[PDB]
Symmetry: C2
């Protein structure tokens, strides 16, 4: 239909004719190829659709109107603003309580789409009171009573309320939403679990307080459980969430360790997906930046060789992650922990990266070597370490770094040579 | 407290040693007490160090300390920005030392990736021109791999995020460098450049048109065929976005060869690639009749039947749209061909899905096929075909008053063709 035919149908008293016009509106607006949103807005149909949302006696017009408004709101930011300024959010909220599952589900879908448009529209959805009725839909004793698709839609909408920054989700909304998320994390549907794991990863990517609210729920063991799921769509967000948690305090890290996360890292560090490998080595770098007893547990789980192997044969971006793992280890670790690291063969791959162009990495590696030499001084075995570095051609690499083109690297390698190779 | 004292020392080396210690202290992203660091007022000290052209190490070290601070909460990034770091970093881009430039590039990319507001501040202080001048060299292979990757990531962060989208002028400055970067051979540079274009193409048609007019689409299409998933994924997103634009923008994509690649995309083992490619195809079948005809000409209809029949539900849903868009805009002959390719049975089997929107969309597709049948006088033959594959039973199952929309749609088809 045309913008004229639809406007005539919508300005008709014949409610059935109004329904047909809105359906035509749906068909023109549902195409993601040139939906005539601008002229439909200029026609004043947004308030008409919003009003139709309230026609409880005609569920099809509510469903069709909700679909039209969502399609409009999925366009430019100004079009989303036009739908929100049209009063669509309260009207969608009123549809949440419909006795018709597909009607409430359309309202959930519409509200999740608005919220996922960005942080300002998410906060509007929260501001107008969407969280309470959305969560009330999951207040049932057994979550298996709800259909799969219905639950996935709700889970995705809540995920969207947790997502995005600048600003982060309001504190109060996070507090209200969190208990429902932890429950969903014990549901058996893979899509629900993925979305929930993503929701928690969003929540834990933020200030320490947020990490604290997540860990306190006692959900970290379940995250750790899902860290070993076979479904990569589940493992990836679970690993990110755990990774975010170990960027917090030494205690928050200990909560991750106590749940058994380290036991899963033998597979994660060799996972054929390079992204899982990198994220796993990132997460370990933040663990080895913790206490010495936490470094000891990394050792106890046989994780050091995997780190060495990663440093030796992985891609450069993952090797950089491993450089930070090793340096943090050497920086906080005990002398015996450093000997073990050298006993794992760290020197040779560590020296091979000294041909990288990354100044930061070069300087971080030299610092690691300095920390290894310090452990040697405390034992009085710096001579064997020096020869060892020379044996694998490490010293030649260090001397190659004495190039005046890079004064920071020149001075760093010169200091190392004066103290231990002079 | 001792760290602040070292920073406020008159001896040059002592200040260097304090900020270096600060860099190392900040190196580790493990619960650092920055709140007091802001209270102590160290951010403005670092920023001043960046201007110390005569002492390259101090510049390097402070750049590292400020970027570490800028990679936390919004207030920490805000403190860094209000500290005048952004202009300082921009001044640092012109350094004759490569490893100093890079540090600034990295700091600016982190700030810009924090969000749209800081992205626009980075642009507003004038970062775009000096960032691009670093890539204005004749042979990009002369630049170190790590240095180019950093620059390319920073550019993609300057094209990322919306509400608001990047400013138009900055995008028009950046796009010609993005073009040249997509001819580089490094897989990471290509991935980041494709991501940047996918950001630029995720918006209104006028933004799409900025991209298309650069002439870059044929190179994007070539990358659609890369073996590296981390390249195919964003290239495919970009192409899919561009085909959500005008019919003419869609023709640019077809003319660049895209459809020859879809036999591989539609059967790709990554289910996400299948989904995005079927999404992309659905937007192409939503185009003009000659475009539908090119889809037909490139042998793709059997591929779309197979996807509708055997793919996962998320991909099947995109295939449903692709089919309905085809039957909505296609000729009678194109629709006959669709039926000849076997679309009826896989389409009817999806009428068991619980998604009301998908159900109504499938029924629309059926009605459109029946309209082609009416023009040919073969509505009975079509009904028989639908009844034979159990389709009619599936339509009748939809006769449930608990869902009035589905009941009304399914009732119309039953009354009109199955009375």
């Amino acid at each position: 239909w045309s913008v004229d035919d639809i406007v005539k149908g919508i300005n008709s008293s014949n409610v059935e004719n109004q329904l047909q016009a809105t359906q035509a509106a749906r068909k023109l607006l549902s195409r993601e190829k040139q939906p005539p949103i601008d002229n439909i807005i200029r026609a004043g149909l947004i308030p008409k659709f919003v009003s139709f949302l309230g026609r409880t006696d005609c569920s099809p017009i509510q469903f069709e109107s909700a679909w039209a408004l969502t399609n409009i709101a999925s366009g430019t930011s100004e079009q989303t603003k036009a739908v929100v300024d049209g009063g669509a959010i309260p009207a969608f909220i009123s549809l949440l309580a419909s006795p018709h599952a597909h009607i409430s589900e359309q309202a959930v879908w519409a509200l999740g789409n608005i919220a996922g448009d960005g942080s300002v529209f998410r906060d509007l959805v929260i501001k107008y009171g969407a969280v309470d009725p959305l969560l009330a839909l999951l207040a049932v004793p057994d979550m298996s009573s709800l259909a799969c698709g219905y639950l996935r839609n709700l889970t995705w909408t809540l995920s969207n309320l947790c997502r995005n920054k600048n600003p982060a989700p309001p504190i109060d909304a996070v507090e209200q939403i969190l208990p429902t998320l932890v429950r969903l994390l014990h549901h058996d549907d893979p899509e629900v679990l993925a979305d929930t794991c993503w929701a928690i990863s969003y929540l834990t990517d933020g200030p320490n307080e947020r990490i604290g609210m997540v860990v306190k729920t006692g959900v970290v063991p379940q995250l750790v459980k899902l860290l070993g799921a076979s479904e990569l769509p589940i493992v990836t967000p679970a690993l990110r969430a755990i990774g975010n948690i170990v960027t917090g305090t030494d205690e928050q890290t200990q909560v991750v360790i106590d749940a058994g996360a380290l036991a899963v890292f033998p597979s994660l560090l060799t996972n054929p997906k390079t992204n899982i490998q990198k994220e796993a080595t990132w997460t370990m770098s933040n663990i080895t930046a913790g206490r010495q007893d936490q470094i000891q547990q990394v050792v106890n789980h046989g994780l050091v060789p995997f780190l060495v192997s990663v440093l030796s044969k992985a891609d450069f971006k993952t090797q950089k992650e491993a450089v930070w793992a090793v340096t943090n280890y050497t920086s906080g670790g005990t002398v015996e922990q450093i000997v073990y690291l050298v006993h794992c063969g760290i020197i040779e791959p560590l020296m091979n990266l000294l041909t990288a162009k990354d100044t930061k990495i070069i300087l971080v590696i030299l610092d690691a070597i300095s920390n290894i030499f310090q452990a040697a001084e405390k034992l009085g075995e710096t001579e064997k370490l020096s020869i060892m570095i020379e044996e694998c051609g490490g010293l030649d690499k260090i001397e190659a770094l004495q190039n005046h083109e890079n004064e920071s690297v020149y001075k760093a390698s010169l200091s190392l040579i004066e103290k231990y190779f002079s």
